[PDB]
Amino acid sequence: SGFRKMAFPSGKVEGCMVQVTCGTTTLNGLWLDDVVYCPRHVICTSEDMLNPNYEDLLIRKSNHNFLVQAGNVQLRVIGHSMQNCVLKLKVDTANPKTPKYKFVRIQPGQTFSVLACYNGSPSGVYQCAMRPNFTIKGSFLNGSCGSVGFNIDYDCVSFCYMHHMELPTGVHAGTDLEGNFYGPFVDRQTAQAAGTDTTITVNVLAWLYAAVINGDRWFLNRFTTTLNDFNLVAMKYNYEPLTQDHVDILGPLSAQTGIAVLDMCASLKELLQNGMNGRTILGSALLEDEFTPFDVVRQCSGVT
Amino acid sequence: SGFRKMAFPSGKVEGCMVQVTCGTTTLNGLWLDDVVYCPRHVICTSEDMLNPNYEDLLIRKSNHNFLVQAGNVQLRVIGHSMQNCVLKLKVDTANPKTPKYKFVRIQPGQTFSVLACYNGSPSGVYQCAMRPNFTIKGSFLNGSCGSVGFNIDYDCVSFCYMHHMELPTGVHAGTDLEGNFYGPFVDRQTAQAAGTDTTITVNVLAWLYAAVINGDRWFLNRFTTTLNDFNLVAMKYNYEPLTQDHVDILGPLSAQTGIAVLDMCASLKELLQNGMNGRTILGSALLEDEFTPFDVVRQCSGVT
Numbered sequence: 366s367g368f369r370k371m372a373f374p375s376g377k378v379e380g381c382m383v384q385v386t387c388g389t390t391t392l393n394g395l396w397l398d399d400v401v402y403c404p405r406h407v408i409c410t411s412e413d414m415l416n417p418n419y420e421d422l423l424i425r426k427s428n429h430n431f432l433v434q435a436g437n438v439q440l441r442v443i444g445h446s447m448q449n450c451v452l453k454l455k456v457d458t459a460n461p462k463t464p465k466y467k468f469v470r471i472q473p474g475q476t477f478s479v480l481a482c483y484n485g486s487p488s489g490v491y492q493c494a495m496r497p498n499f500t501i502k503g504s505f506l507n508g509s510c511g512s513v514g515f516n517i518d519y520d521c522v523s524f525c526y527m528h529h530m531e532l533p534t535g536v537h538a539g540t541d542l543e544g545n546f547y548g549p550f551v552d553r554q555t556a557q558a559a560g561t562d563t564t565i566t567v568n569v570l571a572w573l574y575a576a577v578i579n580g581d582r583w584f585l586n587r588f589t590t591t592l593n594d595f596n597l598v599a600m601k602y603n604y605e606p607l608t609q610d611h612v613d614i615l616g617p618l619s620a621q622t623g624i625a626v627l628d629m630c631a632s633l634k635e636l637l638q639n640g641m642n643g644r645t646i647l648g649s650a651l652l653e654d655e656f657t658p659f660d661v662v663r664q665c666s667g668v669t
Numbered sequence: 670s671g672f673r674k675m676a677f678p679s680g681k682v683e684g685c686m687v688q689v690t691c692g693t694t695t696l697n698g699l700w701l702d703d704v705v706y707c708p709r710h711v712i713c714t715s716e717d718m719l720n721p722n723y724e725d726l727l728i729r730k731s732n733h734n735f736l737v738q739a740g741n742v743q744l745r746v747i748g749h750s751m752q753n754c755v756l757k758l759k760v761d762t763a764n765p766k767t768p769k770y771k772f773v774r775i776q777p778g779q780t781f782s783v784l785a786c787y788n789g790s791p792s793g794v795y796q797c798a799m800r801p802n803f804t805i806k807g808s809f810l811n812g813s814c815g816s817v818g819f820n821i822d823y824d825c826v827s828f829c830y831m832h833h834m835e836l837p838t839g840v841h842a843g844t845d846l847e848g849n850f851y852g853p854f855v856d857r858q859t860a861q862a863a864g865t866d867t868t869i870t871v872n873v874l875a876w877l878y879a880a881v882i883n884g885d886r887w888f889l890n891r892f893t894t895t896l897n898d899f900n901l902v903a904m905k906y907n908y909e910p911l912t913q914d915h916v917d918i919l920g921p922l923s924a925q926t927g928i929a930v931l932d933m934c935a936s937l938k939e940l941l942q943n944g945m946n947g948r949t950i951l952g953s954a955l956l957e958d959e960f961t962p963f964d965v966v967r968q969c970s971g972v973t
């Protein structure tokens with residue numbers, strides 16, 4: 366028993382981290398097979414970031430201008446190309462530590478682990494969620510750019526995120542591993558306000574099921590609701606509308622606990638309308654939305 | 670910017686995890702150099718756990734009764750001994766993945782990362798604290814025993830915890846890597862109530878400094894206090910008494926932010942007396958005590 370915000374074991378990703386330097390700019394790269402992936406803004410100086418023309422900037426760069434260091438060993442760059450907002454540096458050596466991997470573009474509301482790195486060196490790992498507004502609330506200081514987000518299924522690492530920037534509000538924006546930004550963000554030092562950060566309703570319900578499984582049951586009530594009645598409450602509290610797809614993925618948790626999804630919705634409805642009344646659920650005094658139904662099942666069963 | 674409950678990169682520990690089986694009991698082992706460390710209750714059946722005589726049970730065991738598997742490869746056990754509550758299985762092969770390491774017995778209030786494992790396979794990593802009552806609030810299911818806690822300083826892993834059991838309250842107890850339990854707990858299936866779980870005051874203050882650094886400043890007030898006045902409040906709210914040693918370790922955070930430690934104590938005092946009033950600090954609606962002053966400095970500076 367016990368429920369924690371758990372990240373995936375980061376070992377498979379640590380072996381892929383490298384340092385990429387171009388001119389006086391240094392950031393993190395991801396070395397998989399004979400390619401190093403990094404944010405294209407490695408070619409920029411601070412002055413260039415105000416309004417960069419990446420195609421024009423990249424013309425003045427050759428393979429020898431990209432310095433790729435894997436710990437203490439230097440990689441020989443034999444090719445370079447830009448794919449959306451990422452640079453792909455072809456190297457002459459395949460990473461011997463390359464795990465089985467995929468590149469995936471995740472949906473908002475999905476969770477993943479971030480291996481925060483500085484100068485190609487891992488500093489920490491944490492679990493977070495792609496917010497419905499396509500930002501992430503991470504922990505990234507200068508030099509962390511190029512750090513990646515991922516999920517792991519037994520031996521396969523699905524890379525889903527590469528950190529590119531911090532909005533003036535302190536929230537984070539980045540791309541998938543094809544270099545396409547999540548959300549409307551551009552890799553330019555210009556104020557880009559993020560949209561409304563709604564709560565991921567299906568995740569809060571999954572976490573409420575995790576709480577019942579682990580003994581925190583005070584919030585269970587004698588009520589039920591309907592999808593449309595619950596969504597009237599969800600809209601008022603800036604929660605994402607719940608759909609039958611969300612109810613379906615909560616099915617295994619509803620079966621294990623014996624609590625119907627709409628009954629759990631009525632508990633959530635009352636929690637939204639009345640608050641916690643000074644109480645806690647799984648060590649939290651607010652409704653947690655960074656655990657997906659898959660994460661709850663995985664943790665509550667011990668999947669390795 | 671941003672502040673997250675970050676765990677250390679787990680790679681160095683993943684390479685040490687093995688599966689240890691004795692009879693019909695299977696748990697996790699830690700393979701460092703030519704020794705595998707695991708909880709001594711691997712020699713017990715469920716029936717033995719009610720009142721085990723480990724010395725008498727271990728007499729009926731030989732080296733060939735301990736099955737040690739590192740992924741898919743089997744290790745040859747050439748020696749076995751009991752040191753307090755851990756078994757040390759000498760194997761004929763040194764772990765090629767053994768990182769630089771130390772064994773440390775941590776103090777209550779200190780934090781560490783746990784690599785939750787099942788059958789020798791890592792499932793997740795999370796950061797937690799050794800509570801003042803010598804329990805940890807982890808996430809451990811059946812088969813997770815032998816999972817370890819650690820800290821990392823650049824290339825050196827300091828192992829500090831090995832999971833042994835769950836109290837009937839759902840909190841967790843374990844040993845240092847010399848097999849000595851933290852707290853008064855014994856490795857026996859008998860009700861062992863834990864003492865009062867107090868809040869780690871120095872950690873809450875460190876987290877309040879992390880919040881100010883990251884822009885959450887609403888809780889700063891126009892007041893100050895004294896160590897004795899603050900401790901009257903700390904005692905009423907089951908917070909650990911603050912000492913000049915605690916003030917001293919908060920010195921770098923007080924210097925960086927310009928907020929005197931006693932002024933931050935007066936903010937904490939008002940938060941204890943008035944609550945959060947429906948507000949949040951670093952995404953939390955309660956006062957977080959699982960970040961040490963060292964963790965806050967490390968994260969707020971980017972130590973790898």
Ligand SMILES: *CC(=O)N1Cc2ccccc2C[C@H]1C(=O)NNC(C)=O
Pocket residue numbers: 406414506507508509510529530531532533551552553554555
């Ligand atoms: C790596 C990083 O932190 N960056 C890269 C980048 C990309 C796009 C626009 C601006 C920058 C600069 C920097 C930041 O995101 N830093 N803070 C800002 C611009 O708010």
Ligand SMILES: *CC(=O)N1Cc2ccccc2C[C@H]1C(=O)NNC(C)=O
Pocket residue numbers: 710718810811812813814833834835836837855856857858859
């Ligand atoms: C590994 C494990 O979960 N254990 C080992 C152990 C050690 C000491 C006493 C009892 C047991 C059984 C088991 C538990 O801790 N499980 N739950 C209990 C006993 O509450």
